[PDB]
Amino acid sequence: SGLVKMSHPSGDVEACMVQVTCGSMTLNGLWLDNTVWCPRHVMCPADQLSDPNYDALLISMTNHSFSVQKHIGAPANLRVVGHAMQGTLLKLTVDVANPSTPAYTFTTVKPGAAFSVLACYNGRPTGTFTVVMRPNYTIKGSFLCGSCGSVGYTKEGSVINFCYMHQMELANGTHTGSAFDGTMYGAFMDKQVHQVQLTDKYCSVNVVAWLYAAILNGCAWFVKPNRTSVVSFNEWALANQFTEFVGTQSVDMLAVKTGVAIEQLLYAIQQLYTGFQGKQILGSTMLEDEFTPEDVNMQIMGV
Amino acid sequence: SGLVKMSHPSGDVEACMVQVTCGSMTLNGLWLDNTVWCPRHVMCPADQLSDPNYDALLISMTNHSFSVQKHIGAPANLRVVGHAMQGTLLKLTVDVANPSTPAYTFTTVKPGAAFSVLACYNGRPTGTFTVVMRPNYTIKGSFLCGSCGSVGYTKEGSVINFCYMHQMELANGTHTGSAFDGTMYGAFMDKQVHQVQLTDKYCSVNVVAWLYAAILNGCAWFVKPNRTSVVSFNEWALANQFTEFVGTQSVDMLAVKTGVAIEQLLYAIQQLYTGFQGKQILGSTMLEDEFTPEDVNMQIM
Ligand SMILES: *[C@H](O)[C@H](C[C@@H]1CCNC1=O)NC(=O)[C@H](CC(C)C)NC(=O)OCc1ccccc1
Ligand SMILES: *[C@H](O)[C@H](C[C@@H]1CCNC1=O)NC(=O)[C@H](CC(C)C)NC(=O)OCc1ccccc1
Secondary structure, three states, X not given: OOOOOOEOOOHHHHOOEEEEEEOOEEEEEEEEOOEEEEEHHHHOOOOOOOOOOHHHHHHHOOHHHOEEXXXXXXXXXXXXXXXXXXXXXXXEEEOOOOOOOOOEEEOOOOOOOEEEEEEEEOOEEEEEXXXXXXXXXXXXXXXXXXXXXXEEEEEOOOOEEEEEEEEEEOOOOOEEEEOOOOOEHHHOOOOOOOOOOOOXXXXXXXXXXXXXXXXXXXXXXXXXXXXXXXXHHHHHHHHOOEOOOOOOHHHHHHHHHHOOOHHHHHHHHHHHHHOOOOOXXXXXXXXXXXXOHHHHHHHHHOO | OOOOOOEOOOHHHHOOEEEEEEOOEEEEEEEEXXXXXXXXXXXXXXXXXXXXXXXXXXXXXXXXXXXXEEOOOOOEEEOEEEEXXXXXXXXXXXXXXXXXXXXXEEOOOOOOOEEEEEEEEOOEEEEEEEEEOOOOOOEOOOOOOOOOOOXXXXXXXXXXXXXXXXXXXXXXXXXXXXOOOOOEOOOOOOOOOOOOOOOOOEOHHHHHHHHHHHHHOOOOOOOXXXXXXXXXXXXXXHHOOEOOOXXXXXXXXXXXXXXXXXXXXXXXXXXXXXXXXXXXXXXXXXXXXXXXXXXXXXXXX
């Protein structure tokens, strides 16, 4: 198929990762300009994680409660000169600006969108992978104890858009974190209690992109002349655990390159949801929603 | 499952990528110490990729025929002061040693084993992904025009083991390349003609690891008391498009943590191959061979 889970090269972000230690708890931080970001439950005692009072924990801290260390590249112990709490994140101001700060922005990812993750333990990057923000605001990641503060991002040009800081593993095997405005994705809360999670959905726009990728690879058995309008598909999706389809220029590019209209694939999805009739698509017998229209454009067509 | 396709952080390898131009052909090179490695077909004009005489092309090159440029980090134009051909690769000697040269070795990767790929264009890293070397010595990569010289590697502690330099896409969707001794993986030639692709097979050790990943996540409906010896399974495997199983300490670790014997999962594979009978394993109805015993051990400790 030529489609793989492709992450951004992680070098620019590796040079920003630090270890943050507060008392007995230790995890990862992101060092940008004079600021280090990390999850606020690094303040919390390991025997108080269900019902922490983060406001009281904050009050009890000083600048000297925080130990910030960079082990990668040029090592350094960074002097914390200020501390603040924003939602589920701390902002630690340090006396040294990171000389390796890339051009960056902060942004929020939406369901169906993909981003790269740099998994870190004790301030050391250990691996990278890409995930899709699920419609229930979890990601299907690979995170163990000590991974919090691991960072997710996309890149536009030379600009890194940080969009995720890892916080938590849910009862199923999935994961969630905060955007860098400090709000948790999907109104989970960063406390060690059992929380209900929304039910997931198929990302319709991503299924469509994937079927275009099959067509680009010559696999078009599911294509028929029949069509389903976007309006009627979206009414259909609400009754069948799919997100509503919202067209983008990226999808339009796939339609023009293949001669297959979006509505034909929308009709195809309604049929394929009932069953693949034995046959498979790109080696799969189920619908796949982990590739975006941008991924198909980049990887198959170099756009 | 806690299972994703995870590649190594790429920073160390990003600092070693360069762009190598010869004539009107451009692609990527790997700059280690004073050597720049790149695919020899940089010397070949595009109209002649079908049957290149690399002996003659190399003869007609001079040091000045090659331009090597570093775009990432501190940009630099390196003087080529020697050029040599080793199998399907060129080894260019440049006047200055890469000051970012990591600790490294060269190895060859075996079928079933996973490695990370740094995909590059014009010497600029653009993506990273992980692959398993298939039994027919292809990889299911994502490569376009201009990606040759992209590099595959594993990392042991602080040592990078370079094992793959990208060369070509085959008629099906797959890709192959060279080891750093210059030999192509699996009987291919760096000539643009259609060539015989051998048949792929399932990587049984990887199916075994995946079944252990399932057990670890409480999905053990397929486990029975029945056993198939490694010997009997391997005779069966040659008949059914499976690699022969060879145990390792990594698989043994999974057998011990779960208490389920390798020979139980081999019996399971034989039944599962005929069909899952509407059942599911970690969200699939076909066997999965893309995750190694090592992946399962590390990601699901
Ligand atoms: C935060 O560093 C970290 C993330 C977890 C660790 C296990 N896998 C992860 O992704 N650990 C936490 O314990 C997190 C912090 C709460 C105060 C929000 N809590 C959590 O993930 O609870 C679920 C859980 C913990 C340990 C194992 C399995 C699930
Ligand atoms: C080197 O840049 C290139 C990588 C190919 C380009 C398309 N996708 C790839 O992975 N390798 C070649 O172009 C290779 C050169 C031979 C002398 C080894 N030829 C090749 O791969 O032909 C197949 C092909 C070419 C162009 C598009 C699709 C398939």
